[PDB]
């Protein structure tokens, strides 16, 4: 009648991904945590671009969309920032945004590559991920002699549900019951299916025997970060956000029940 008691093991933890296993929880909770990884972990991304000059071969919306897709380090600032919609300020302010500027002109006969290195931030802690101390810089546009790009941009807090640019993940691997003991899939020819990396079976055995009393446990994750957040930070933020959603629903339901 009561809550589960999940346990966690971390098997791999690098700068770009975290691999871990959750045990003693329900499939619905695991899938909801995955979905929150993808869509409900807040991130800082460019969502407001003013173009002062653009002589490049790409039109303004092209450049703005590419800028919006540039990942920015949000590890600690994002929790502090308010949603611009919730801020009481004018257009933008330091409590709900980060200002960026770009001003590049090509005055030479060799092609000028405008990269995220040319995005100058007002906040030292919110910068393009590739501009952090190998990996090259993200190309924005290429300029030839006489062409120029000058713009002002603001980065705001958001999550992947609104737009994919606020999605912090670069692939969420999710898996349970590596050997098909629950028979949630049915292989017409089991022997010709490659083994899962989490499989614990001999090479002569294609799948585990059917388990009539089994339930999905031991969910396997590999969360890969796009660079805006650390993978462990992605996981912790997802847990906190799901908890916050449940708490808000609880408060609203309490008000509704008391109202009658």
């Amino acid at each position: 009648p009561y809550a589960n008691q999940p346990t966690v093991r971390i098997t791999e933890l690098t700068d770009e991904n975290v691999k871990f296993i959750i045990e003693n929880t329900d499939l619905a909770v695991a899938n909801s945590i995955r979905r929150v990884f993808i869509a409900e972990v807040p991130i800082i991304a460019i969502d407001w671009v003013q173009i002062d000059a653009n002589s490049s071969v790409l039109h303004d919306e092209f450049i703005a969309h590419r800028l919006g897709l540039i990942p920015l380090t949000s590890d600690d600032i994002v929790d502090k920032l308010q949603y611009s919609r919730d801020c009481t300020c004018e257009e933008f302010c330091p409590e709900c945004s980060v200002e960026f500027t770009l001003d590049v002109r090509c005055n030479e006969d060799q092609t000028r590559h405008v990269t995220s290195r040319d995005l100058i931030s007002n906040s030292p802690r919110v910068i393009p991920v590739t501009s952090r101390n190998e990996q090259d810089d993200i190309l924005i546009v290429k300029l030839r002699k006489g062409q120029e790009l000058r713009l002002r941009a603001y980065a705001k807090k958001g999550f992947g549900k609104e737009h994919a640019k606020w999605n912090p993940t670069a692939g969420v691997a999710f898996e349970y019951d590596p050997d098909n003991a629950l028979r949630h899939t049915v292989y017409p020819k089991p022997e010709e299916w490659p083994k899962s990396e989490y499989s614990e079976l001999d090479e002569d055995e294609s799948q585990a025997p059917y388990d009539p009393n089994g339930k999905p446990e031991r969910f396997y994750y590999n969360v890969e970060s796009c660079g805006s957040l650390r993978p462990e930070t992605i996981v912790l933020s997802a847990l906190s956000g799901l908890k916050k959603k449940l708490s808000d629903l609880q408060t609203q339901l309490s008000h509704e029940i008391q109202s009658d």
């Binding site: 009648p1 609104e162 908890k243």
Partner: protein, 115 residues
């Protein structure tokens, strides 16, 4: 041209209620919970947690239309229980599980980082 704004899927429109409670008159001790601006995430977790409750006879949820942002949760309990109590207890259980998971993930991350 007819595209809805992206924020419409999670922002409540002025005057819209987050959650509404109605009685299911077909059978006793049954309630329908309509939640606005929520999707399969919350609906699925809440439904599964409710199914874990032995005093819950029926628990289910659905999204009436994918282009709308409403979920309906139907709960039936035994006469000694209430669907409202079951819903509240399910949310409390989910919050407790998530808090424990967060604590244990923090501990595991620290362990992995030290060695």
């Amino acid at each position: 041209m007819n595209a809805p704004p992206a924020f419409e899927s999670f922002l409540l429109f002025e005057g819209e209620k987050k959650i509404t409670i109605n009685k299911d008159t077909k059978v006793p001790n049954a309630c329908l919970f309509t939640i606005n601006k929520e999707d399969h995430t919350l609906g699925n977790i809440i439904k599964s947690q409710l199914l874990k409750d032995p005093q819950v006879l029926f628990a289910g949820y659905k999204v009436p239309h994918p282009l709308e942002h409403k979920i309906i949760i139907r709960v039936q309990t035994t006469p000694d229980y209430s669907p409202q109590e079951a819903f509240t207890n399910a949310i409390t259980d989910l919050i407790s599980e998530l808090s424990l998971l967060e604590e244990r993930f923090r501990v595991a991350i620290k362990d992995k980082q030290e060695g």
